[PDB]
Amino acid sequence: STGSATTTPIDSLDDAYITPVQIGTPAQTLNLDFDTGSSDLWVFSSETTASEVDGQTIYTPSKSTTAKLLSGATWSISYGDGSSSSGDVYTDTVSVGGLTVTGQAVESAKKVSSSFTEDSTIDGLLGLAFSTLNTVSPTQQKTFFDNAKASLDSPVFTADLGYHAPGTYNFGFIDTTAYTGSITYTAVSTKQGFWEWTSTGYAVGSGTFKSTSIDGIADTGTTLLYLPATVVSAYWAQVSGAKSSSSVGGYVFPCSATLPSFTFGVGSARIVIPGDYIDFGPISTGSSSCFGGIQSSAGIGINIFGDVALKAAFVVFNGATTPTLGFASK
């Protein structure tokens, strides 16, 4: 089997992408944020405390003939940005772009933090990191990809994110018309439960490529590109009005500037981020300062190849027993 779904940015800055997912019988469609940086599939529901629900579509398990409560299992998760949610667990049928999985755990939120209540566009998250990061207890639950593998034509999934435009998530096949050149594969370390890999170096604009190992994770659920402080400083040093602002939280530059490109190495190949993708957007509407797309990972602890980097390439999450990550220009 295979699946194909359109993913669309939730706003004009590409803050995050949502993809519709059908849960239960008959199907209830919810727009979830596909996150390669965690392993929990959780949604807003009829169990979510009322005052924390605000504009999202919820999943009601009592209206699904295929839902089953998973006795005694509970979950609790917190994210990099400080948000969190917790609740109980049901198993149900979930389908994405035509690919159906029976018995998938769908974690039902009893409570959600403020930032989730505040964003009307995201109905929950669908985790696609390794199952060892799953928060359910006492027994962890498999992600939608892991439950899907047995039926997939091939055990992979690809992410083709667009810049200010929809894109696609594919399950079980590699669409050869969506990229140019050939895909270059790099090893993944699953020690930390992420799709963790090491870039062989970087280049800023038309300058030299420096070979230096940069270990990071490929995370479709992080908006920005977070790299080591000395590489982020070498990039901004090439933009005349950029400065690090403590008040805004990062490097800012005049919206007026033409930013240089950023290239990252994958093995012997190079993936080039055009400069316009690096210009995240004005600090406030009408402002003349814009927030930069590449920022320091020093305070986070790990480098993160987020959406700014992933939307410049076609990326293959090869889920074979020894997983690998593939990148191609597009």
Binding site: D15, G37, S38, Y79, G80, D219, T222
Partner: peptide, 8 residues
Amino acid sequence: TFQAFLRE
């Protein structure tokens, strides 16, 4: 307004 999906 950025997001950064697991981790303490």
